[PDB]
Design a protein around this ligand. Sequence first.
Ligand SMILES: [Zn+2]
Length: 258
Amino acid sequence: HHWGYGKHNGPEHWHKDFPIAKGERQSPVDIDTHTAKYDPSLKPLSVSYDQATSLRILNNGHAFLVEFDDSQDKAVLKGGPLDGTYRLIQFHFHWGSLDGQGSEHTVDKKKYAAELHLVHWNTKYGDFGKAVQQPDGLAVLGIFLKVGSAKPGLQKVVDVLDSIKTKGKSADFTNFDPRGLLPESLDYWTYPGSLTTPPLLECVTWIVLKEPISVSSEQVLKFRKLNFNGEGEPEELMVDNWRPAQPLKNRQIKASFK
Ligand SMILES: [Zn+2]
């Protein structure tokens, strides 16, 4: 018994256990493309994933995560609005029950079928646990997914989902190249925010790419066959595991492009 995305434990209930849910820099938010400010001082993003080492893929009952070895600077994110090096620790998705919903961030109110989050932590803080307690501890790269052509680089992930159908299941997942999930362009918006799942800490510096990647209906369909529940109990399909847009309040979204 805890938090989830159902009617009685969904996002609207999270604030009771995690007061920060009504905080000043909560995520996701709607990106108003006409209010975003182009900032010439923003540097190009630097993604160095050539030595990435994936370890496992896990169903934690809220989504499925693909965990990486973050004991060294093997897969890092630098540049952009960041100061220092951020190490990739895991990536996961949020998706919907239908192609018209699923993303957490929205663009001019437009919702995408899913959203990919690549989570990185600031190496100055040693470890993930310490990083989440700092305002500049995390840097999450957000990528939108739209239904269309199949994404070859995502197929290895969809084919193993059958092995981690229920909450608690994990499987070995080595030699996966996260570079296959990136779009052509690295243009982005960025704003200070939080983790979109409890405990909703406001330690994120969000970097949302403008260009979405396309995945096939067959690929996204497989995401929808996962279960929120553990093996041996009422089957609840894992769908609509997204938090709705939160108030922007005293924050401005910057764009790396004109
Ligand atoms: Zn996420």
